[PDB]
Amino acid sequence: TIENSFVGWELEEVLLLDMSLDDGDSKIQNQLKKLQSPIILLYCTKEEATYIFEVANSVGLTGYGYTWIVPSLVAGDTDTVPAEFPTGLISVSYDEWD
Amino acid sequence: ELFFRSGFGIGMRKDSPWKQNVSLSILKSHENGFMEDLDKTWVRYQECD
Amino acid sequence: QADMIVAPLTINNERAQYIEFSKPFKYQGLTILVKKEIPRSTLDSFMQ
Amino acid sequence: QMKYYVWPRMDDHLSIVTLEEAPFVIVESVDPLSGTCMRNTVPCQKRIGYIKKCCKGFCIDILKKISKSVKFTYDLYLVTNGKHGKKINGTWNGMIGEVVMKRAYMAVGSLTINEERSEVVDFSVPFIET
Numbered sequence: 001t002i003e004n005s006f007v008g009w010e011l012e013e014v015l016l017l018d019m020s021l022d023d024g025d026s027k028i029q030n031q032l033k034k035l036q037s038p039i040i041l042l043y044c045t046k047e048e049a050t051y052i053f054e055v056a057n058s059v060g061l062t063g064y065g066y067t068w069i070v071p072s073l074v075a076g077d078t079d080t081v082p083a084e085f086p087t088g089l090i091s092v093s094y095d096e097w098d
Numbered sequence: 099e100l101f102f103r104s105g106f107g108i109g110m111r112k113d114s115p116w117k118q119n120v121s122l123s124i125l126k127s128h129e130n131g132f133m134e135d136l137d138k139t140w141v142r143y144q145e146c147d
Numbered sequence: 148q149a150d151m152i153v154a155p156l157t158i159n160n161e162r163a164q165y166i167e168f169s170k171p172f173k174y175q176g177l178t179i180l181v182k183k184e185i186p187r188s189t190l191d192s193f194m195q
Numbered sequence: 196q197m198k199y200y201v202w203p204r205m206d207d208h209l210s211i212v213t214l215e216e217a218p219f220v221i222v223e224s225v226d227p228l229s230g231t232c233m234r235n236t237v238p239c240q241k242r243i244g245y246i247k248k249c250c251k252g253f254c255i256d257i258l259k260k261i262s263k264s265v266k267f268t269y270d271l272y273l274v275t276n277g278k279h280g281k282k283i284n285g286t287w288n289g290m291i292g293e294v295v296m297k298r299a300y301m302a303v304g305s306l307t308i309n310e311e312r313s314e315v316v317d318f319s320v321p322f323i324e325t
């Protein structure tokens with residue numbers, strides 16, 4: 001999309017997370033410390049999503065001035081909120097009400 | 099050709115009581131034709147072409 | 148020892164960090180002054 | 196179709212007024228293909244129900260370059276009540292008519308320093324002769 005766009009998009013911090021081995025929080029902490037953008041894209045599942053945000057609030061990314069957007073499966077259910085997500089989380093989900 | 103433009107200024111020590119009325123008794127000397135009159139009698143009399 | 152520098156004093160970023168300036172009372176610039184050479188003239192005889 | 200024309204959530208968030216002056220602040224309409232402002236222009240709103248235009252020029256490149264050094268955020272919006280300000284029996288209307296009304300907190304554009312306006316707001320250092 002970026003190549004075929006007159007509008008200017010700034011790309012940065014394209015690093016991924018290899019959350020597979022134990023005691024990776026120290027590695028995650030440096031990975032979480034390399035983000036310097038007002039909005040950060042995150043793509044995980046409902047079970048995996050809560051693990052990442054346990055470190056996100058530790059450094060202090062969550063709050064005003066920072067926005068996180070996740071796919072539909074991160075929320076999982078329309079009402080069953082695990083309360084493990086930062087205030088202001090916005091996501092796109094499949095239509096179910098109509 | 100002029101390459102560094104910055105006007106003059108009646109500097110004063112920071113945080114001085116007079117710092118506001120001086121900057122308004124200069125802006126009022128431009129409009130009345132005063133500082134265009136001192137310019138006439140001191141700086142713009144012609145002696146050589 | 149002085150409270151008001153009534154003189155031609157340019158305003159720039161180094162001085163403005165310690166003292167307070169006013170609104171400019173003259174707008175200027177920097178220009179170069181060089182000696183004017185003689186215009187000369189070549190007309191004394193019509194055999195030129 | 197978003198129900199919120201502007202995001203509700205917002206002191207580094209400053210309103211800023213501007214007006215169209217021919218060589219300084221040029222207002223060009225939004226590109227039809229994408230409906231968004233292209234490069235080199237900071238998006239600028241408009242009143243009448245809002246329409247998003249795009250602004251660029253000499254007095255805008257100052258705003259982008261200054262904002263980088265002092266690290267704040269802004270959102271321009273064109274003024275729709277008079278131009279540049281004029282005192283009509285105790286009312287100011289224009290780029291200088293909103294800063295006092297506590298709806299602007301800044302006014303970038305082609306203003307002009309003089310005594311009558313300077314009793315209401317306090318201008319910055321001049322940066323061009325006029």
Ligand SMILES: *[C@@H]1O[C@H](CO)[C@@H](O)[C@H](O)[C@H]1NC(C)=O
Binds near residue numbers: 115119
């Ligand atoms: C500046 O002028 C105002 C106008 O009357 C006056 O009230 C004030 O005392 C003056 N201040 C100084 C420092 O001259």
